Amino acid sequence: KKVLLKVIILGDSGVGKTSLMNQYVNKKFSNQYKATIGADFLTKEVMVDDRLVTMQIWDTAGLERFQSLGVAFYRGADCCVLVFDVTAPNTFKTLDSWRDEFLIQASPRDPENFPFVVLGNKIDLENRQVATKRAQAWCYSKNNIPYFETSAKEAINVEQAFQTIARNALK
Amino acid sequence: QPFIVLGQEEYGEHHSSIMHCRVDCSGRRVASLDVDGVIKVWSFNPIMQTKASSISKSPLLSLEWATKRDRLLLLGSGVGTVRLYDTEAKKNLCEININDNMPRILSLACSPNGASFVCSAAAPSLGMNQVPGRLLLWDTKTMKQQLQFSLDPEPIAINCTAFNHNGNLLVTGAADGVIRLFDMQQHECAMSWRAHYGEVYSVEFSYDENTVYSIGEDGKFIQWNIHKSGLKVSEYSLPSDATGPFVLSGYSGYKQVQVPRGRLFAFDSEGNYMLTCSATGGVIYKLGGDEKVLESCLSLGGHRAPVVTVDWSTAMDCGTCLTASMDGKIKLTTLLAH
Ligand SMILES: Nc1nc2c(ncn2[C@@H]2O[C@H](COP(=O)(O)OP(=O)(O)OP(=O)(O)O)[C@@H](O)[C@H]2O)c(=O)[nH]1
Numbered sequence: 001k002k003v004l005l006k007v008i009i010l011g012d013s014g015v016g017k018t019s020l021m022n023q024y025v026n027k028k029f030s031n032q033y034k035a036t037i038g039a040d041f042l043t044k045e046v047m048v049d050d051r052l053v054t055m056q057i058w059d060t061a062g063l064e065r066f067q068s069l070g071v072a073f074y075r076g077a078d079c080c081v082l083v084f085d086v087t088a089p090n091t092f093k094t095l096d097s098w099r100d101e102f103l104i105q106a107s108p109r110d111p112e113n114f115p116f117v118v119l120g121n122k123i124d125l126e127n128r129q130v131a132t133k134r135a136q137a138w139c140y141s142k143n144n145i146p147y148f149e150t151s152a153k154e155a156i157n158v159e160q161a162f163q164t165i166a167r168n169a170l171k
Numbered sequence: 172q173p174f175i176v177l178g179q180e181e182y183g184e185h186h187s188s189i190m191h192c193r194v195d196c197s198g199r200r201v202a203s204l205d206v207d208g209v210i211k212v213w214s215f216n217p218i219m220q221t222k223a224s225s226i227s228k229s230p231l232l233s234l235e236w237a238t239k240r241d242r243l244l245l246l247g248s249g250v251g252t253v254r255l256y257d258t259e260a261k262k263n264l265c266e267i268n269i270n271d272n273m274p275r276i277l278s279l280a281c282s283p284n285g286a287s288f289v290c291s292a293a294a295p296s297l298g299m300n301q302v303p304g305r306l307l308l309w310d311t312k313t314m315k316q317q318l319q320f321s322l323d324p325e326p327i328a329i330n331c332t333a334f335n336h337n338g339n340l341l342v343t344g345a346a347d348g349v350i351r352l353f354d355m356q357q358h359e360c361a362m363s364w365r366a367h368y369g370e371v372y373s374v375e376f377s378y379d380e381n382t383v384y385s386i387g388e389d390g391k392f393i394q395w396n397i398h399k400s401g402l403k404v405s406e407y408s409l410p411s412d413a414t415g416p417f418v419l420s421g422y423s424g425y426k427q428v429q430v431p432r433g434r435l436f437a438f439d440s441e442g443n444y445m446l447t448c449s450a451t452g453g454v455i456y457k458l459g460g461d462e463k464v465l466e467s468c469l470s471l472g473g474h475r476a477p478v479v480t481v482d483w484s485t486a487m488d489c490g491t492c493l494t495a496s497m498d499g500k501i502k503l504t505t506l507l508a509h
């Protein structure tokens with residue numbers, strides 16, 4: 001039987017949230033950058049221990065700071081995707097802000113076990129600025145959030161991030 | 172064209188006008204309740220089999236399948252109680268005492284999380300159902316009222332309720348014509364808007380849950396944007412016999428009248444089509460965006476009395492429409508999607 005999951009992608013502007021979503025669903029990438037304006041979605045069918053999941057993936061304007069969207073949007077959510085840019089340490093220091101802002105607006109009853117995934121995006125580029133150990137430690141401190149280093153450009157670990165939040169939400 | 176009609180069977184074990192008719196979450200069972208308080212849980216796959224039959228001494232007004240524990244049926248009485256009924260044991264599990272002075276349990280919604288249900292408890296009728304009411308979140312395994320929702324401005328009878336997919340949101344329609352959307356942990360409504368000049372009769376989330384549908388006493392079927400506080404997305408005027416009042420008349424000067432009490436509109440598995448009521452049988456519309464009129468893409472027929480409530484059970488790409496009418500008959504039309 002069909003199961004809907006709504007997935008929110010959060011993070012600073014330019015970290016690659018649109019790129020990651022388009023790579024997951026459309027499987028393509030564009031080096032040209034054009035800022036996301038409000039919140040909007042793409043939908044794709046995935047599957048999890050032989051049960052079909054309709055996954056509604058939402059893109060948020062990073063410049064908008066997760067602020068004036070609907071309760072209908074905030075409380076509809078079942079998964080949160082936190083994205084930072086490994087070549088940009090400020091995008092990492094804002095993770096606590098994005099996760100706190102999600103937990104305030106989305107307000108899950110069981111935040112500890114809410115399906116989060118953290119993506120250090122853009123590892124295809126050299127000149128990393130954020131140490132892997134440091135992101136691992138941050139993700140661990142928030143009761144062991146699953147951590148992936150990803151590239152929407154080279155399609156590295158996008159499937160793993162989405163599968164992880166899908167499985168853990170279906171629990 | 173989209174649907175191939177494979178057949179129509181009739182369930183005829185009720186002998187009074189049907190009030191509710193709902194398929195469980197598995198698709199394999201129906202619960203149906205008539206105005207004389209008779210409950211039937213029955214199968215149609217592979218044979219039309221009355222799996223259980225109760226006669227309630229007290230009036231019953233609403234009916235709702237459990238989601239987590241399918242085989243559990245919730246039944247709202249006219250004496251302020253909610254009965255949990257085990258359809259595989261054919262047995263009452265319990266009767267939860269909801270409210271003393273507001274006895275009409277007009278609506279029930281089981282949370283998809285399996286722990287709680289929301290119910291609507293309205294004062295007695297007598298525009299007869301613009302009286303006050305309560306909307307309560309009840310936590311079944313603690314056996315206590317977890318939350319009472321604020322019905323601004325005044326308490327009002329809630330006709331109809333529906334949960335979103337994760338159970339965080341509840342859309343409701345009241346006797347005063349207002350839709351109210353409630354967060355399951357804020358007692359204040361997250362959102363409300365005037366929706367019908369008249370009572371709201373049925374509400375439902377769209378498949379993708381970015382809009383809500385309502386059908387109202389003013390005869391209109393409206394889709395609302397719940398990301399922009401009930402901004403009308405689309406509006407349609409359904410035939411007069413889709414919202415009633417439903418009237419069965421005889422040569423004897425004896426007439427029965429029924430105001431929408433049950434499910435008025437039902438959807439295929441992903442919301443492209445909508446079953447509704449008519450005097451002759453179910454009428455299926457497509458829901459694409461012509462925006463001036465809805466195209467009537469299929470008509471099921473088969474009823475000699477007005478249809479007052481519908482349901483649409485989907486799996487297999489094999490849909491199964493239920494149409495229930497005032498002579499107590501329930502028709503079951505099986506469709507194949509193409
Ligand atoms: N090298 C490399 N570049 C990337 C990668 N992901 C995204 N980019 C580039 O980074 C820029 C930002 O991409 P977007 O996906 O639009 O960023 P965004 O998170 O949607 O930004 P906002 O919509 O403004 O919040 C784009 O020009 C991408 O081409 C990546 O994995 N590797």
Ligand SMILES: [Mg+2]
Pocket residue numbers: 017018035036059060061062
């Ligand atoms: Mg974006």
